Amino acid sequence: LAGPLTPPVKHFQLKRKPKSATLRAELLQKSTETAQQ
Amino acid sequence: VGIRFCQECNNMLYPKEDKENRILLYACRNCDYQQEADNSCIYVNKITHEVDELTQIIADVSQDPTLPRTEDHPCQKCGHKEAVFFQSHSARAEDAMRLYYVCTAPHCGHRWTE
Amino acid sequence: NLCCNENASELVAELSTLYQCIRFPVVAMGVLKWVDWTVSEPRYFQLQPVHLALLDEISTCHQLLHPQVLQLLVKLFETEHSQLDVMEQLELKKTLLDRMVHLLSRGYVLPVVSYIRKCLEKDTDISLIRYFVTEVLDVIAPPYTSDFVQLFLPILENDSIADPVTEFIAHCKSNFI
Amino acid sequence: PILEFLEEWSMENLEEISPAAIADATKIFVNGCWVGIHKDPEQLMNTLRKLRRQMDIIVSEVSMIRDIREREIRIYTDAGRICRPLLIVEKQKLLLKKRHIDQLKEREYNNYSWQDLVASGVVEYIDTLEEETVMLAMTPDDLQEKEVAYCSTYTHCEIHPSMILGVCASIIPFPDHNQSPRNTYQSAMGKQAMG
Amino acid sequence: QKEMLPHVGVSDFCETKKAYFLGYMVHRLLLAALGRRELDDRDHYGNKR
Amino acid sequence: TVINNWLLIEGHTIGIGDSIADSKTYQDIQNTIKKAKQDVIEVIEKAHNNELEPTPGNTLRQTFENQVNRILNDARDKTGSSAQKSLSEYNNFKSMVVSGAKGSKINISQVIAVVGQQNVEGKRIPFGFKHRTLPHFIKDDYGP
Amino acid sequence: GAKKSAIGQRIVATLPYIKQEVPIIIVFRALGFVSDRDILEHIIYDFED
Amino acid sequence: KDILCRLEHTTLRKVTANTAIYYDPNPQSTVVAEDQEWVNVYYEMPDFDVARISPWLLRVELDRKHMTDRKLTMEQIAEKINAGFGDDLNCIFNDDNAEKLVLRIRIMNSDDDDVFLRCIESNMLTDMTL
Numbered sequence: 001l002a003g004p005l006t007p008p009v010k011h012f013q014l015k016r017k018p019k020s021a022t023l024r025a026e027l028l029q030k031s032t033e034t035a036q037q
Numbered sequence: 038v039g040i041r042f043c044q045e046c047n048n049m050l051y052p053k054e055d056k057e058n059r060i061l062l063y064a065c066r067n068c069d070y071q072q073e074a075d076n077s078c079i080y081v082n083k084i085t086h087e088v089d090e091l092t093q094i095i096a097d098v099s100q101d102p103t104l105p106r107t108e109d110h111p112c113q114k115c116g117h118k119e120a121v122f123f124q125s126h127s128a129r130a131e132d133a134m135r136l137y138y139v140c141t142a143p144h145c146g147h148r149w150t151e
Numbered sequence: 152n153l154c155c156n157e158n159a160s161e162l163v164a165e166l167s168t169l170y171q172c173i174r175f176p177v178v179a180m181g182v183l184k185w186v187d188w189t190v191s192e193p194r195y196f197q198l199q200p201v202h203l204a205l206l207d208e209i210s211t212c213h214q215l216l217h218p219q220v221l222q223l224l225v226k227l228f229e230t231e232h233s234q235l236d237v238m239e240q241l242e243l244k245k246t247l248l249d250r251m252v253h254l255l256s257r258g259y260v261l262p263v264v265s266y267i268r269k270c271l272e273k274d275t276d277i278s279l280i281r282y283f284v285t286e287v288l289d290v291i292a293p294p295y296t297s298d299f300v301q302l303f304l305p306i307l308e309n310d311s312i313a314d315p316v317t318e319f320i321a322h323c324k325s326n327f328i
Numbered sequence: 329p330i331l332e333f334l335e336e337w338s339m340e341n342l343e344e345i346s347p348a349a350i351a352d353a354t355k356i357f358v359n360g361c362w363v364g365i366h367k368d369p370e371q372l373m374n375t376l377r378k379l380r381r382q383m384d385i386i387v388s389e390v391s392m393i394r395d396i397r398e399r400e401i402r403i404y405t406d407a408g409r410i411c412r413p414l415l416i417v418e419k420q421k422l423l424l425k426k427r428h429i430d431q432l433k434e435r436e437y438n439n440y441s442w443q444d445l446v447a448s449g450v451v452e453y454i455d456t457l458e459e460e461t462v463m464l465a466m467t468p469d470d471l472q473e474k475e476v477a478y479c480s481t482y483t484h485c486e487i488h489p490s491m492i493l494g495v496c497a498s499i500i501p502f503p504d505h506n507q508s509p510r511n512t513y514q515s516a517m518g519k520q521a522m523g
Numbered sequence: 524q525k526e527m528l529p530h531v532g533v534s535d536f537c538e539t540k541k542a543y544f545l546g547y548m549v550h551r552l553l554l555a556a557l558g559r560r561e562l563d564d565r566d567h568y569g570n571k572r
Numbered sequence: 573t574v575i576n577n578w579l580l581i582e583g584h585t586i587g588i589g590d591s592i593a594d595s596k597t598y599q600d601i602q603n604t605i606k607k608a609k610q611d612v613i614e615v616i617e618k619a620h621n622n623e624l625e626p627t628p629g630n631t632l633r634q635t636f637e638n639q640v641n642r643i644l645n646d647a648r649d650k651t652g653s654s655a656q657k658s659l660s661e662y663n664n665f666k667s668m669v670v671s672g673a674k675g676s677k678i679n680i681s682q683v684i685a686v687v688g689q690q691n692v693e694g695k696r697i698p699f700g701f702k703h704r705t706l707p708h709f710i711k712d713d714y715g716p
Numbered sequence: 717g718a719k720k721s722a723i724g725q726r727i728v729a730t731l732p733y734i735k736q737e738v739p740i741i742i743v744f745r746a747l748g749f750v751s752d753r754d755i756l757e758h759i760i761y762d763f764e765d
Numbered sequence: 766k767d768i769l770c771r772l773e774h775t776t777l778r779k780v781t782a783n784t785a786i787y788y789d790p791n792p793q794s795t796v797v798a799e800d801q802e803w804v805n806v807y808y809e810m811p812d813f814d815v816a817r818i819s820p821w822l823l824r825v826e827l828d829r830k831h832m833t834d835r836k837l838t839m840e841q842i843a844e845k846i847n848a849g850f851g852d853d854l855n856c857i858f859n860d861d862n863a864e865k866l867v868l869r870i871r872i873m874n875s876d877d878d879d880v881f882l883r884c885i886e887s888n889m890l891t892d893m894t895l
C-alpha cells in the first residue's frame with residue numbers, strides 16, 4: 001500500500017539498552033518455568 | 038564475646054590491664070587469680086541483630102501435628118520429600134514472613150530457609 | 152483466549168506466546184486496548200506490574216503505535232488514586248516514567264519530552280521530572296540533534312540537583328547553542 | 329501416682345543430675361512443680377496418652393501438654409481446669425466405629441454408657457492448655473476426607489460444633505443466621521421469659 | 524523455707540529444688556528479654572482456674 | 573394519619589423472598605469470593621518466598637496486612653454492588669433502605685451476599701491460640 | 717544515672733514479706749550457692765549461648 | 766524528604782549495626798586486620814595521640830542504608846561527637862568509601878578508662894542527636 005518505510009530519525013546512540021530488555025529476559029524465564037509446571 | 042570463670046572459686050573473670058606490660062589479663066576478684074586474655078575484645082553488642090533462627094530451630098518440631106507439611110521442598114541431607122514449614126514469629130522479627138523448613142523424616146533434622 | 156480468560160494468573164506463563172503474537176501489529180494494539188481498559192479501571196493496583204511490560208514490547212516492535220502508548224501512559228500519569236499510599240503513587244508514576252523512557256529510546260523523543268516540559272511548567276512534583284531526566288541522561292550518548300536539545304535543555308535549568316549531567320551540559324553548550 | 333509412674337520410667341529426678349543434661353532434655357512439670365527431666369519426650373507422651381485413654385494410673389481429667397519448641401512437658405492434675413470431650417482421630421480416621429453407636433442405641437438394658445466410650449479410648453477430655461497442642465477437625469465427614477491437602481495430621485474431631493453454645497444460647501433456632509448481638513440479647517431474654 | 528516458692532516444697536532439703544525452679548524463672552525472663560518466647564497473655568484461658 | 577391509612581391498602585412487609593437473589597447473582601458472588609481468596613493466597617505465597625517487598629513507611633507485616641485488607645474490602649464492595657443490582661423494584665428490603673426508614677446498603681449486602689471481615693481493635697482476628705486463631709487451623713495461617 | 721545504664725539492665729526479685737526488692741544472685745547465695753558458675757548452671761543450661 | 770530528615774530525631778543507635786570495645790595495646794597497630802589499612806593512614810599524622818593514647822578501642826559499625834536514608838556523612842558524625850564530648854575523646858573514622866563504616870574512639874592522651882567507654886556507648890547510643 002504505502003511502499004517502504006522510513007526508519008526512525010536517530011537522535012543519539014544507545015550506549016546501553018534500557019532495562020526493559022532485562023525485564024523481558026526475566027519474564028521469559030518465568031514463562032519457561034511455568035511451562036515446566 | 039566469650040565468658041571466663043575462675044579456676045579456683047568459679048567466679049566471673051573481669052578484664053583488667055597491666056600498664057607495666059600493656060596486655061589484657063582476665064583477673065578474678067575476691068580471689069586474686071589471673072589469666073592471660075587472648076580475645077582482645079572485652080565487649081561486643083549488635084543493634085541490627087542479624088541473628089539466624091535456624092540456629093534456634095529444633096528438629097523435634099517435625100513432630101508437631103499443628104504445623105503444616107509440604108511436599109514441594111524435599112530435604113537436602115536425605116532427599117525426603119515431606120517437610121514441615123513455619124515462620125520464626127518472635128521478637129527480632131516481624132520484618133520478614135520467611136519460612137523455615139524442617140525435614141520431616143526422623144534422624145535427619147535438616148533445617149533450612151529458602 | 153488470554154484476555155477473556157481472566158482467571159489471568161497464567162499471564163506469566165503466556166508471556167512468550169504473547170510476545171510472539173504481539174509481533175503481529177494488529178494483535179499488539181488489540182493488547183493495547185485490552186491493557187487500557189484493564190489498567191484504567193479503579194483499584195487495579197494491588198500487585199507488586201506485568202501489563203506495562205506488555206506496553207514495553209508494544210513500543211519495541213511497532214513505531215506506528217508510539218502515539219497510542221504515550222496517550223495511554225499520560226492518562227495514567229494524570230489519574231488520581233485514593234486507595235494508594237502517597238509514596239506508592241510516587242513509585243507508580245516512577246514506573247510510568249520508566250515506560251515513557253523506554254518509549255523515548257525508540258526514537259519518539261520529541262512528543263514525550265514536550266509533554267514532560269508541559270506538565271513541568273503548566274503541576275506534578277519536581278522529583279518525578281528530576282528522576283525522568285536522570286533516566287534519560289543514563290542511556291543517551293552523543294551526538295544529538297538541535298530539536299532534541301531545543302526541548303531537553305530548557306527543562307534542565309529549573310533544578311540544580313544531580314557525571315552525565317555536567318557532561319551533557321559541556322557537550323550541548325559548545326555544540327548546540 | 330503420676331510421680332511414681334514417671335519415676336518408674338526413665339525420668340531423671342532433679343537432684344540426681346548434673347546441670348549439663350538440662351540443655352538437651354525436656355523439662356517435666358507436674359502441677360507446676362518441676363519434678364525432673366526426660367531425654368525422649370515423644371515416647372513419654374505416647375505412653376501417657378495411652379494410659380489416660382485406658383483409664384489406667386492417669387485419670388481422665390489430667391491434662392498433658394508438650395511444648396515442643398521450648399522442650400517442656402507440663403502435666404496438670406489440680407482442680408479448676410476447664411475441659412471438653414473430643415473424639416480421638418488416628419491416621420485420619422475416627423476411633424468411633426459403628427459398633428459403639430449400636431451399643432449406645434440400646435443404652436438401656438445394656439449399661440453401655442458414656443463412661444464406656446471414655447474407657448474405650450475413643451473420646452477424651454481436652455483442656456485449653458492442651459488444645460494449644462491439638463489439630464482439631466470441625467467434622468469427620470469433610471475435614472479428614474481426602475482432598476487437596478490442607479492438613480493430614482488431625483488428632484481430634486469435634487462431636488458437634490453446636491456444643492460451643494450455652495444453655496440459653498442453645499434455644500435459639502438458626503443462631504448462625506443472626507447478627508451476634510441479637511444472639512446475646514436473646515440469651516439475656518430467655519432467662520426472663522414466662523413458662 | 525516457707526514463703527518463697529512453697530509449692531516446690533517447705534522441707535529443709537528442697538533448697539536445690541527451689542534453686543532450680545528460681546533459675547528456671549530467671550531463664551524464662553531472659554528468654555522473654557531475648558524475645559525467643561512470646562509474653563504470656565493474661566486473658567488466655569489456659570492460665571485460668 | 574393520611575399515609576398510615578393509605579398503607580392499609582398498600583401494605584408493607586418483609587420476608588425471605590426479599591433476601592433471595594437470582595442464581596446468576598449467587599454464582600457471580602461465589603466467583604468474586606473464589607477470586608479474592610486466590611489473590612489472598614498469591615499475596616501469602618509471595619510473602620512466604622520473600623518476593624513481597626515492603627511499602628515505604630511500613631514493615632513487611634503491615635504491607636501484607638494492608639494488601640489482604642484491601643483485597644478483601646474490594647471483594648466485599650464488589651459483592652455488595654452485585655447484590656444490590658440483583659434487587660427488584662418490589663424488594664421490600666430495598667424499599668425500606670431507599671426511603672431511609674431503616675437499614676442501609678451494607679445491611680443488604682451482608683444479608684444477601686457476604687457478611688465480610690470481622691475486626692477486633694480494628695485488625696483481623698488475633699492469634700489467641702499459639703500462632704492460631706483457633707485449633708482447627710494450621711499454625712501460621714493468614715488465609716481469609 | 718550514667719553508670720546503671722552503662723552496666724546494662726539487671727534483674728531483681730520481689731519476694732513475699734519483704735518491703736524491698738533484692739538482686740537475684742543474692743537470693744541464690746542465700747540458698748547456699750557461692751560460686752557464680754553454679755548459679756548460672758541453675759539459670760543458663762547451655763553455656764554456648 | 767530532605768526537610769523530613771532534618772526534623773525526625775535521629776540518634777546514634779538508629780545508624781549503628783554493632784559496637785565493640787577492644788583493648789588494642791599498640792595504637793599504631795590494630796587487633797583487627799581490615800582496620801589496619803586505613804588506621805595506618807590516620808596515624809601518619811597523629812593528632813592528640815602523638816604520645817601514648819589509652820589502650821582502649823571503641824570500634825562501631827554503621828549501617829550503610831540508614832546512613833544514606835538520613836543523608837548523613839562520616840564527617841558530621843565525627844564533628845558531632847567532638848562537639849558533644851570536647852577533646853576528652855579522640856574519634857578516628859574510616860573514609861566514607863569502604864563498606865565497613867567504622868569509627869574508632871579512644872580517650873585523649875592527657876587523662877577507670879574501661880567502664881567509662883561502656884558508659885560512653887550507653888550515652889551516645891541514646892542521648893546523642895545526630
Ligand SMILES: [Zn+2]
Pocket residue numbers: 043044045046047048065066067068069070
Ligand atoms: Zn577466683
Ligand SMILES: [Zn+2]
Pocket residue numbers: 112113114115116117140141142145146147
Ligand atoms: Zn532430611
